[PDB]
Each structure stands twice: as C-alpha cells, then as structure tokens.
Amino acid sequence: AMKIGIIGVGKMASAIIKGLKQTPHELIISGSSLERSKEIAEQLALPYAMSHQDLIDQVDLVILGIKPQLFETVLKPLHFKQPIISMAAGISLQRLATFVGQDLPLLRIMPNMNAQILQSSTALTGNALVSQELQARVRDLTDSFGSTFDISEKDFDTFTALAGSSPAYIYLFIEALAKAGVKNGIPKAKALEIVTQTVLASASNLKTSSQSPHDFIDAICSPGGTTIAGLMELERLGLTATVSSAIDKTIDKAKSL
C-alpha cells in the first residue's frame, strides 16, 4: 500500500483520483500554488503538500497532471527520487528523462475524461528501467479508472487521438445529430436523450457482435429507404475523410508538442 503524489491537478488528474481513491493507496496532491492546492484538496477530500518537493520527499510514486508545455519549467528545479507517471500528450519518455533524471523508471499513460465514471481507455508504457513488477502495480492503478491497453510508445500519439481526444469528437458528432433534430422540430434535451441512447446501444451492439460496422450499415440500409439516402449524403460531404483529417491534425499536434 504505497503513497502516491499528484503534481498538477486539472480536470484529467481530478477524474483519475476518484478511481485512485478506491485503491488501498494513500494519496496526496500538489497544485500550481498553495491556495490552488488547498482549493482542490478541499473538493477531493485529500491531503495536500506545502510544495512539489515536499510531495516528492514523502511519496513512493509521482503522477504528473500538469500540461506538457509546463514540463521543462515546473520539473527542472525539482529533485525526484521515485518512479514517475506522465499523462502528458506529446512528451516522450526520453524527453521526460532529460527533465527528471536518467536513473528513474518512467511510465507514460494516456487516459481520457471517461475516467470520471471509471471507464477510461488508457494506454500504458514504460522505459527500460521499469521492472515488470512496477509496470504491474501501475496497471492496477490504471484499471481502477477504466481499461488498460499495452501500447508501444511509438503508437502513443495515435492512441492520444483515437482515445484521449476522440470523446470531444464523439460529443461534436452527437451534438450535430441533436442540432439537426432541433432544426427539424425536436427540442434539444429530447433530441440529445434519443441520440445519446442510440449511440450507447449501437456501440454496445457492435461490441458484442462479430459483425463489422459496415456489416451493420448493410443491415440498416433498406433498399430505396431513408438510411441509404442519408449515408450517400455523408459520403457526398466527406464524413470519413473529415474524421480522418481531424485525427491526422490531432497527431501532428501531438508530434510538435
């Protein structure tokens, strides 16, 4: 039952703590100021530390919940002495070692906001210093707020797009369907209820089936019907290309960070 410290606590880091609370481990947090630390510690019902170093001094494992562009500034004056888990997009384990040390085991995760309901899809990977013992204990941590995917580091930026960023794309999609409902006479809340329930069921039906999404499309598209009319419209306007180009842009950005 180790002691875990979280440096930087924004929305992603907060979403993860709910799940970490259901582990046997003891937790402590450290924010961007002492006042911010207290604020967040209050709403999570967890202790906080007097500084990042004070956190580092008492803790067996550190989780970094700060944004990637703050890594160099925030991390360089600190002296780490335990394994570190980064959740940051774009920053390689090699680059992290440059900031914190060549003598530490380092892990990356890529969770998403679904950690809020303990249903994150989280990628996990570690550097050469990560024993199978340590990787296992971290996997136990990630499994506490959803599922875990053994993902080689070269695939992290893609996974960031497919799983970390995609909930927002999924929400834009649902929102577009609901807005189309409003355009055509159905109240927003009601359209959103219908659409969300349909998304949920469709995804569950796919999960438990051996059929492909394209097999399902075939079943739903009655000849001369309404679905095939709308599907050909989605083809005309480039639905697939649009999603793919957005994914590419997500990945480009991850790379340049």
Q: Rule CB under 6 A: say whether 220 interacts with ligand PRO.
A: yes
Q: How many residues does the chain have?
A: 257
Of the pair 50, 200, the CB lying nearest a second copy is at 200
Footprint of a second copy on residues 110-129 (CB under 8 A)?
A: 112-114, 116-117, 119-121
Q: Rule CB under 8 A: say whether 218 interacts with a second copy.
A: yes
Strand order in the sheet with 146-150: 26-30, 3-7, 61-64, 84-86, 106-110, 120-126, 146-150
* One of 74, 221, 246, 247 touching ligand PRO (CB under 6 A): 221
Measured CA to CA, the distance from residue 3 to residue 27 in angstroms comes to: 6
Which listed option, Na ion, ligand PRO, a second copy, none, makes contact with residue 70 (CB within 5 to 8 Å by class)? none
For the stretch 75-107, what's the b/e string if a residue is b when 16 or more beta carbons lie within 10 angstroms of its beta carbon? beebebebbbbbbbbbbbbeebbebbeeebbbb
- Give which of 241, 105, 243, 102 is closest to 162, Cα–Cα: 243
- Asked whether the CA dihedral 110, 111, 113, 114 is positive or negative, the reply is positive
Q: Rule CB under 5 A: say whether 90 interacts with Na ion.
A: yes
Q: Rule CB under 8 A: say whether 220 interacts with a second copy.
A: yes
Our measurement of the distance from residue 130's CA atom to the centroid of its chain's CA atoms, rounded to an integer in Å, reads 22
Of the pair 132, 152, the CB lying nearest ligand PRO is at 152
Q: Rule CB under 8 A: say whether 10 interacts with a second copy.
A: yes
The residues, any chain, with a CB within 8 Å of residue 200's CB and separated by 6 or more, are none
Which listed option, ligand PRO, Na ion, a second copy, none, makes contact with residue 183 (CB within 5 to 8 Å by class)? a second copy
Footprint of ligand PRO on residues 12-41 (CB under 6 A)?
A: 12
Measured CA to CA, the distance from residue 69 to residue 257 in angstroms comes to: 8
Question: CB 101 → a second copy: shortest distance, Å?
Answer: 26
Question: CB 2 → a second copy: shortest distance, Å?
Answer: 27
- Give which of 7, 32, 4 is closest to 20, Cα–Cα: 4
Number of residues that bind a second copy (CB under 8 A): 116
Q: Rule CB under 5 A: say whether 257 interacts with Na ion.
A: yes
Q: At what angle do helices 34-44 and 11-20 cross, to 10 degrees?
A: 40
Footprint of ligand PRO on residues 58-117 (CB under 6 A)?
A: 87, 89, 110-113
Binding site for ligand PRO (CB under 6 A): 11-12, 87, 89, 110-113, 160, 164-165, 220-222, 225-227
Q: Which residues bind Na ion (CB under 5 A)?
A: 90, 255, 257
